Amino acid sequence: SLPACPEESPLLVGPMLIEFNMPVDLELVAKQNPNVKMGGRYAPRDCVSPHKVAIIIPFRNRQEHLKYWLYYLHPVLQRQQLDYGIYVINQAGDTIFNRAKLLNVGFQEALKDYDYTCFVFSDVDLIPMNDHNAYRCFSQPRHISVAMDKFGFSLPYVQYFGGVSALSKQQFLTINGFPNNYWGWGGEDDDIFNRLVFRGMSISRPNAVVGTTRHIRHSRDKKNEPNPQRFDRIAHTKETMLSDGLNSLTYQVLDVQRYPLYTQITVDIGTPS
């Protein structure tokens, strides 16, 4: 007997001030966010959200960015009236990073907790500047971080699909999820764009003003060097997507930690095969 949440949330305040130069205390963030439940889960008390959103962050050795991520997103996500949870998908070991494989793990592991039907994929260091930028799913795949400060507040190219995006369960399944063999930096987001287009879809986006996004400036991570096979890889997505992705995924979860503001899944995703 709770009614549906309004279609657009009435709590939104639009543009917001964002800064990355003060310390963050997650204990304090937890106290400021008393309705977020153990594991970083929240649904609204007064109405039923149609948006069952798992937010999936690929992660290694970025604890500082993450505290800022949690400090800023958590209040935005409750204002958006989402039935959501946060998953940080922490790559075990010290071998070459694999952004997309981690995202696949996140989708698959999150589905074990709850009937999520929408998946937000968000890099850890991207903070939206306007709460009108909806962190949930549309009838087409949604690109969220459309106007990033580091790209001069516009898209670096019109097919860019990096940074932050959202796919319904069905859209994700329809493309066999993401590729597993993009190791080191670059290209996997293009592959994922290619995948959507070969399955008859197109990219939905908010306007550049609402989609304004801040990137936390940081220097290079070691163990995520530009993948030099990225350019061949994206040229063949149509064939490779058939048998690379969800339907060829394995991993070994080493540990699951329910922190107050997020679930962290530590996972062994291997090295190139």
Ligand X SMILES: O=c1ccn([C@@H]2O[C@H](COP(=O)(O)OP(=O)(O)O)[C@@H](O)[C@H]2O)c(=O)[nH]1
Ligand Y SMILES: CC(=O)N[C@H]1[C@H](OC[C@H]2O[C@@H](O)[C@H](O)[C@@H](O)[C@H]2O)O[C@H](CO)[C@@H](O)[C@@H]1O
Q: Please tell me the distance from the alpha carbon of residue 189 to that of residue 203, in angstroms, as a whole number.
A: 13
- Taking the CA atoms of residue 203, residue 212, residue 263 and residue 253 in that order, the dihedral angle to the nearest 10 degrees is 50
Range 118-157, binding ligand X (CB under 6 A): 123-125
Judged by beta carbon, residue 5 or residue 86, the one nearer ligand X is: 86
Q: Please tell me the distance from the alpha carbon of residue 178 to that of residue 245, in angstroms, as a whole number.
A: 5
Range 208-267, binding ligand X (CB under 6 A): 221, 224
Range 145-164, binding ligand Y (CB under 6 A): 156-157, 162
Task: Decide if residue 125 touches Mn ion (CB under 5 A).
Answer: yes
Judged by beta carbon, residue 101 or residue 195, the one nearer ligand X is: 101
The number of beta carbons lying within 10 Å of the beta carbon of residue 128 is 25
Which residue ranges make up the annotated binding site for Mn(2+)?
125, 218
Interface with ligand X by CB under 6 A: which range of 60-68, 196-204, 244-252, 258-266? Answer: 60-68
Helices (H), 169-216: 169-174, 188-198
Q: Please tell me the distance from the alpha carbon of residue 51 to that of residue 83, in angstroms, as a whole number.
A: 6
* The entry of Mn ion, ligand Y, ligand X, none that residue 157 binds, CB within 5 to 8 Å by partner kind: ligand Y
Which residue ranges make up the annotated binding site for N-acetyl-D-glucosamine?
187-190, 230
**Among 83, 109, 131, 190, contact with ligand Y (rule: CB under 6 A):** 190
Amino acid identity of residue 144, one-letter, is I
* The entry of ligand Y, Mn ion, ligand X, none that residue 244 binds, CB within 5 to 8 Å by partner kind: none
The number of beta carbons lying within 10 Å of the beta carbon of residue 181 is 18
Task: Decide if residue 83 touches ligand X (CB under 6 A).
Answer: no
Maximum CA extent, the chain:
55
Residues that bind ligand Y (CB under 6 A): 156-157, 162, 186-187, 189-190, 230, 234
